[PDB]
Write a protein that binds this ligand. Structure first.
Ligand SMILES: *O[P@@](=O)(OCC(C)(C)[C@@H](O)C(=O)NCCC(=O)NCCS)OP(=O)(O)OC[C@H]1O[C@@H](n2cnc3c(N)ncnc32)[C@H](O)[C@@H]1OP(=O)(O)O
Ligand SMILES: [Zn+2]
Ligand SMILES: [Zn+2]
Ligand SMILES: [Zn+2]
Ligand SMILES: [Zn+2]
Length: 531
């Protein structure tokens, strides 16, 4: 085994102890909570032959005070590792209700407040031990990066370092203050994801809205369509032989699906807080799907700042989507207000343990207020539930109900092969919404090929394998960081550049510093730079 780091930071025993032990003392000062932890657990005093079969690496205050007085701690992380070992043993062996388990959780909250500022004055990120949430006995550990100058190990998520963005490796912020050099800018930002008129309309509408409240904690919101492609939904086998072969419905229906995300600036970095896939059935689509939009999936992570504006901003995006597609020529929109089953995440891979999953009544009230806001603001003319809408229009055939990919109704009808259906319809009236917005539809936006966002499964899968959780602010920041690198570097679109004036292909060009995407053939009112 070969090794080397010449200007590494090494701590002499007295330095660590003088810094670290004021934290070990705050644990001892907890009475009675520290008392079962001041000496090694003795199973023969306590009556637990169990213990050493269950706890393989015992640890306690006295042992830590010994190592800290002997100098057995080379780096500060070895000290912190040993206290969390102490806490983790107790949390493990004892049941979550026991006294000692609660003693431990008091000691741990005390350690957490004490160790963070200390480790940061010693030049580290924090003094926590982090593990990722459980997957399908052991848990996977958060990752570390070493500063190429210090050698001091840091949490990659704490410092938000990624070699793809900064390929010359991780250099700590303090070593950069002596370095003279600041960190170089992350060019893989949300703002810098390719813009679109759909994306632009949504973010432009929300930011003036956030402005009208003018809360000081709020940051900028970026809305980006990150995928678009042309698909078809195949009629399932039962309804197929009963209606397509007869020629009453088309065998497949074309639609354009789009995946879009919103990001907020929080602590000067991008945080993804909202995501949605939609299906858009244009004006050349045969009945019953002609000129319809459907919200396939809507997902969210509650870290928008401030909390008191979070939902209002979700409504603004949704309300904004309807205004946009109405303008392009769509006539009706549809929402299936269904809360996720089990602990299944629609779009984001690990929601906060304490983000409430709403009751369907809550979910339906939510949409109810959402649509009402749009009617009032003169964007929606009206909206009804499927029954008041379906037979107010007097549908009597199953083929007159819109037929959308992955929607409930194609499979209620598909099982109904052997077998009443109007009764199946009446049971769930409230969860299924029909939204009334009111010359071909022309999407002015180009297609974005992005397999990662081609439907909701690809991003869920990649985030589970790579542990991009959205379970905390710090993890969402990291997951967003990497999500954005994936969109920037592994999308599947290649870019041809054309001069906005001469329709010609350009390589060398003058690009406008102000305009959305403006280039001129070398052969204009704005300052231009050569690219
Ligand atoms: O914060 P919200 O606007 O979020 C709405 C969302 C639909 C975006 C959200 O629930 C989400 O991300 N859902 C993902 C999957 C899904 O359901 N998709 C369906 C698309 S139609 O408002 P909420 O409704 O989430 O919550 C607002 C407050 O209500 C509390 N709350 C929610 N669920 C609760 C349950 N089961 N029990 C009790 N309270 C519940 C939340 O805590 C929120 O209260 P605060 O005071 O803000 O904490
Ligand atoms: Zn850390
Ligand atoms: Zn450093
Ligand atoms: Zn210009
Ligand atoms: Zn030109």
């Amino acid at each position: 085994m070969g090794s080397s780091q010449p200007r590494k930071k090494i701590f002499k025993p007295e330095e660590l102890r003088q810094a670290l032990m004021p934290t070990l003392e705050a644990l001892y000062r907890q009475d009675p909570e520290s008392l079962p932890f001041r000496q090694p657990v003795d199973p023969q005093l306590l009556g637990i032959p169990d213990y050493f079969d269950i706890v393989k690496n015992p640890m306690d205050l006295s042992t830590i005070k010994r190592k800290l007085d002997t100098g057995q701690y080379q780096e500060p992380w070895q000290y912190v590792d040993d206290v969390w070992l102490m806490f983790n043993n107790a949390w493990l062996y004892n049941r979550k209700t026991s006294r000692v388990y609660k003693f431990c959780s008091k000691l741990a909250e005390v350690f957490e407040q004490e160790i963070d500022p200390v480790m940061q004055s010693l030049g580290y990120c924090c003094g926590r031990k982090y593990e990722f949430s459980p997957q399908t006995d052991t848990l996977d550990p958060e990752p570390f990066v070493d500063c190429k100058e210090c050698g001091r190990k840091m949490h990659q998520i704490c410092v938000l370092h990624y070699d793809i963005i900064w390929p010359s490796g991780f250099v700590c912020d303090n070593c950069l203050k002596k370095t003279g050099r600041p960190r170089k800018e992350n060019k893989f930002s949300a703002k810098r994801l390719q813009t679109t008129r759909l994306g632009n309309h949504l973010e432009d509408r929300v930011n003036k809205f956030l402005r009208r409240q003018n809360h000081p904690e709020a940051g900028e919101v970026f809305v980006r369509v990150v995928a678009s492609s042309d698909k078809t939904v195949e009629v399932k086998p039962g309804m197929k032989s009963r209606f397509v072969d007869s020629g009453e419905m088309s065998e497949s229906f074309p639609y354009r699906t789009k995946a879009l995300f919103a990001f907020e600036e929080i602590d000067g970095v991008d945080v993804c807080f909202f995501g949605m896939h939609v299906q858009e059935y244009g004006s050349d689509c045969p009945p019953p799907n002609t000129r319809r939009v459907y919200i396939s999936y809507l997902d969210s992570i509650h870290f928008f700042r401030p909390r008191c504006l979070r939902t209002a901003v979700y409504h603004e995006i949704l309300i904004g989507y309807l205004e946009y597609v109405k303008k392009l020529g769509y006539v009706t929109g549809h929402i299936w207000a269904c809360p996720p089953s089990e602990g299944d995440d629609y779009i984001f891979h690990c929601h906060p343990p304490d983000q409430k999953i709403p009751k369907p009544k809550r979910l339906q009230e939510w949409c109810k207020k959402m649509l009402d806001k749009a009617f009032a603001e003169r964007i929606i003319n009206d909206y009804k539930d499927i029954f008041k809408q379906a037979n107010e229009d007097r549908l009597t055939s199953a083929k007159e109900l819109p037929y959308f990919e992955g929607d409930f109704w194609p499979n209620v009808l598909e099982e109904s092969i052997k077998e009443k259906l109007y009764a199946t319809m009446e049971k769930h009236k409230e969860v299924f919404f029909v939204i009334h917005l009111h010359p071909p539809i022309v999407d002015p936006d180009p297609l974005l090929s992005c397999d990662l966002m081609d439907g909701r499964d690809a991003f869920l899968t990649l985030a589970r394998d790579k542990h991009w959780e959205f379970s905390s602010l710090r993890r969402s920041k990291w997951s967003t960081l990497c999500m954005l690198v994936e969109l920037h570097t592994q999308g599947q679109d290649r870019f041809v550049y054309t001069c906005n004036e001469c329709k010609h292909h350009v390589e060398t060009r003058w690009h406008c510093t102000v305009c959305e995407d403006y280039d001129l053939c070398i052969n204009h009112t704005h300052k231009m730079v050569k690219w």
